[PDB]
């Protein structure tokens, strides 16, 4: 059971969204690439928008990518 | 003597850098404008340019704009 009560535990998980996968049938790229995609999204956003905003916009930009640093440590 | 001294040399820079404009008589653009220009597309060339080294010629266009940065406070 204690792997068991673990398994649906966890299965239930992507039940979730599964469920919300059967209501938007839709994907994102994962292993941080729609990070990059939203990064030079907002990395040039930061450059696009710039100021106050990209004080912190390129930062925020920063953490885009930083998803996938942390994968790839 | 001194104020005559940083006389001579700023004379002694301006024709040396006048004499290079008898030769390339471009004027670029001073004051952190240049390190700007500079710092947006090699920015935009390291998002492009390596696929490593992205963290060294934005490092170099960071150090671009530094130059402004420290004088506008």
């Given at each position: 059971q204690?792997?068991?009560?673990?398994?649906?535990?966890?299965?239930?998980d992507a039940?979730?969204?599964?469920?919300?996968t059967?209501?938007?049938?839709r994907?994102?790229?994962?292993?941080?690439?729609?990070?990059?995609?939203?990064?030079?999204?907002?990395?040039q956003?930061?450059?696009?928008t710039?100021?106050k905003?990209?004080?912190a916009?390129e930062s925020?930009?920063k953490?885009?990518?930083?998803?996938?640093?942390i994968?790839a440590?």
């Amino acid at each position: 059971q204690q792997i068991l009560d673990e398994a649906e535990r966890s299965l239930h998980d992507a039940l979730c969204v599964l469920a919300q996968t059967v209501k938007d049938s839709r994907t994102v790229y994962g292993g941080g690439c729609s990070e990059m995609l939203m990064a030079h999204a907002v990395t040039q956003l930061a450059n696009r928008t710039p100021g106050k905003e990209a004080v912190a916009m390129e930062s925020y930009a920063k953490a885009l990518r930083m998803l996938p640093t942390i994968i790839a440590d």
